[PDB]
């Protein structure tokens, strides 16, 4: 059943199973798969460039990591400024680098703080215990529970989803 009042469900996405297997082979855990699953249908980067944001808010890669976090945590982007955000687009064509950056970012911030910045950027890092951040985290963990409960879900075409507001 759906997490705390939210609307949720599942459906089939052609080719998604093979893509899940590629993400796992690139080092993605079930948590990583859950984040990717929440962010795009096909675990890809065909969403609009930067997800229509610029600077520190721009999103890159299959997890929609933001440039603030990438430049703060990932060695690939060390020392870079907000205005250099176009450099994050390297993650759009390298799954291995995308996963490496995700892991570096999660380790840099710790996972609970990582969720806050992933959801809400600099504002989230400074106010990480909001209701909206908690709802995002709950959505990810609900998806993860579906993946964890049946290993077929790690390789099949099923996408689990939870409705969260776009911000
Ligand atoms: O620090 C720069 C800027 O960040 C602002 O927060 C944004 C983040 O940087 C991300 O862009 C974040 O995107 C996530 C949201 O969950 C989206 O709904 C989703 O589509 O993509 C990602 C991953 O889930 O969005 C926030 C909000 O726009 C904000 O903190 C701002 O004050 C700050 O200057
Ligand atoms: Cl991020
Ligand atoms: Cl807070």
Q: Burial, 156: exposed, middle or buried (Cβ in 10 Å; 0-12, 13-18, 19+)?
A: middle
Distance CA 117, CA 17 (A): 29
The resolution in Å comes to 1.2
The method recorded for this entry reads X-ray
- Rounded to 5 degrees, φ, ψ at 36 are -60, -40
Q: Assign 3-class secondary structure to the chain.
A: CCCCCCCEEEEECCCHHHHHHHHHHCCCCHHHHHHHHHHCCCCCCCCCHHHHCCHHHCEECCCCEEHHHHHHHCHHHCCCCHHHHHHHHHHHHCHHHHHHHHHHHHHHHCHHHHHHHHHHHHHHHHCCCCHHHHHHHHHHHHHHHHHHHCHHHHCCCEEEEECCCCC
Tokens of 16: 């998604």
Pocket of ligand 1 (CB under 6 A): 39, 51, 53, 56-57, 59, 64, 66, 68, 118-124, 166-167
- Counting the structural domains of the chain, the total is 1
The ligand 1 atom at the shortest distance from the C-alpha of residue 165 is 18
Cα 149 to averaged position of ligand 1 atoms, centre (Å):
30
Domain that holds residue 164: 1-167
């Amino acid at each position: 059943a759906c997490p705390s009042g939210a609307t949720c469900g599942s459906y089939t996405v052609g080719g998604l199973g093979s893509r899940k297997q590629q993400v796992r082979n690139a080092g993605g855990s079930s948590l990583d798969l859950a984040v990717a699953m929440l962010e795009t249908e096909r675990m890809d980067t065909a969403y609009p460039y930067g997800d229509n944001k610029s600077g520190d808010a721009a999103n890159f890669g299959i997890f929609k990591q933001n440039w603030l976090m990438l430049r703060s945590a990932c060695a690939q982007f060390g020392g870079q400024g907000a205005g250099q955000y176009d450099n994050g687009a390297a993650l759009n064509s390298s799954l291995g680098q995308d996963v490496s950056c995700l892991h570096q970012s999660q380790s840099h911030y710790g996972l609970d703080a990582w969720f806050a910045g992933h959801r809400n950027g600099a504002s989230g890092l400074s106010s990480p215990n909001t209701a909206d951040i908690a709802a995002y985290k709950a959505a990810v963990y609900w998806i993860k529970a579906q993946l964890d409960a049946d290993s077929a879900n790690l390789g099949n075409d099923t996408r689990f989803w939870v409705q969260v507001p776009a911000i």
